[PDB]
Amino acid sequence: MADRLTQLQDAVNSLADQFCNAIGVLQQCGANPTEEYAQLFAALIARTAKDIDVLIDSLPSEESTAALQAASLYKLEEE
Amino acid sequence: EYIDQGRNPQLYTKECLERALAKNEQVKGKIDTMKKFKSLLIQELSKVFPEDMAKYRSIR
Amino acid sequence: GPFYLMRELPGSTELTGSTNLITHYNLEQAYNKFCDLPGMIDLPGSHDRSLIEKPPILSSGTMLAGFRLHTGPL
Amino acid sequence: RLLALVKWANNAGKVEKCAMISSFLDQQAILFVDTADRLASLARDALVH
């Protein structure tokens, strides 16, 4: 839908669902397999964390808020 | 029901000891796997925020 | 500075499942011993309604008695 | 049978230790899965709302 809010929300949900199952999965299945999984999981979680940080800068600041937009619309209505 | 068949309890105690030891070994295995997974995820992403890792190491 | 809702972690090593529970519970030498008694029983006797005794155990006038019943020798 | 019982009567310690150790792990086992289930439940329902 090309919306900033949708992308940010989606990333958080994947982390919640992806990490809850993974910790349980680690407990579930026990040499070679345990070590590789640790890296594979850490990798994804790390990637998601980096993505979240990138997303916050993009959103607009406190200035030029909704009230200001309405004010802008006023002058525009006369035009 | 173990006496019903007829056998000394030493074998049963040996079996209990070996099954408890097997449970202890698999618990130790899962513990060390989650410990090494924690260590590898900690060291893998040490660069995301150095201050957070410093505070984590200080608090421990 | 501080993160939201930090708290104190528990005492460094209390009772866990990561310790050797048997050696802490003083049961090591019994295991190191351990790792048929009917046969043990067999050595004392001969061999080892055995169907009847089990059923009796599943649920769970000595002088006068001798005088009362007489068994023919031949 | 009585002799076997009275011989095991002093050998009732190690079996009890093994049983309680197995129960501890079993009792603990319900706890880890329950925590995992709660996390799984939250993602499925709480996130959607």
| Full DSSP string of A29-58 | ---HHHHHHHHHHHHHHHHHHHHHHHHHHH
Which sign, positive or negative, has the C-alpha torsion C15, D40, D27, C22?
negative
Element (H, E) at D49: none
In this structure, which amino acid lies at residue C69? L
SS3 A24: helix
CB B28 within 8 A of CB D21: no
Instruction: Name the amino acid, one letter, at C7.
Output: R
- CA A28 to each of CA A60, A71, B20, B34, D43: distance values in angstroms, whole numbers, following the listed order: 44, 58, 19, 11, 19
Residue C4 phi, psi (nearest 5) = -70, 130
Residue D1 DSSP one-character state: -
DSSP assignment of C3-47: PTT------TT-S-SSS-HHHHTT-HHHHHHH--HHHHHHTTSS-
Rounded Cα distance between B52 and D30, Å, is: 33
Look up residue A28 and give its amino acid.
Answer: Q
- Decide if C25 contacts D16 (C-beta within 8 A): no
Residue of A18, A1, A10, A79 whose CA lies nearest to A51: A10
Is the Cα dihedral C48, C52, C56, C58 positive or negative?
positive
User: Measured between alpha carbons, how far is A25 from D36 in angstroms, rounded to an integer?
Assistant: 9
Alpha-carbon gap: D38 to the closest alpha carbon of chain C (Å): 21
Chains in touch with B (≥3 Cβ pairs < 8 A): A, C, D
Minimal-distance CA residue of chain D relative to B1:
D1
- Nearest chain D residue to B19 by CA: give it: D18
The amino acid occupying position A10 is D
Burial of A8 (0-12, 13-18, 19+ CB in 10 A): middle
Q: Write out chain C residues lying below 8 Å of B36, CB-based.
A: none
Rounded to whole angstroms, the Cα distance separating B31 from B12 reads 28
- Report long-range pairs for A50-55 (Cβ below 8 Å, ≥24 apart): A50/B48, A51/A11, A52/A8, A52/A11, A52/A12, A53/B48, A55/A4, A55/A7, A55/A8, A55/A11
Which structural technique was applied? cryo-EM
Q: Are B16 and D14 in contact (CB under 8 A)?
A: yes
- Residue B28 burial class via C-beta count within 10 angstroms: exposed 0-12, middle 13-18, buried 19 and up: middle
Q: Which amino acid is at A53?
A: D
Q: What single-letter DSSP state applies at residue A9?
A: H
Quickly count: other Cβ atoms within 10 Å of residue B16's Cβ.
21
Q: What is the CA radius of gyration of chain C?
A: 30
CA angle B5, D21, C23 (to 5 degrees): 105
The amino acid sitting at C1 is G
Cα(C61)–Cα(C44) distance, rounded to whole angstroms? 30
The beta-carbon neighbor of D40 closest among A12, A20, A27 is A20
Contact A20 D33 (CB under 8 A): no
- Per 3-state DSSP, chain D is made up of helix, strand and coil in percentages (nearest 5) of 80, 0, 20
Residue burial D10-48, b: 16+ Cβ < 10 Å; e: rest: eeeebbebbeebeeebeeeeeeeeeebeebbeebeeeee
For chain B, give the number of residues.
60
**Residue bearing tokens 């209990």:** B16
User: Distance between CA A47 and CA A32 in Å, rounded?
Assistant: 23
Which one-letter DSSP state was computed for residue D46?
T
The DSSP 8-state label assigned to residue D10 in this structure reads: T
Euclidean distance between CA atoms C4 and B46, whole angstroms: 21
Residues of B with CB under 8 A from a CB of D: 3, 8-10, 12-13, 16-17, 19-20, 23-24, 27
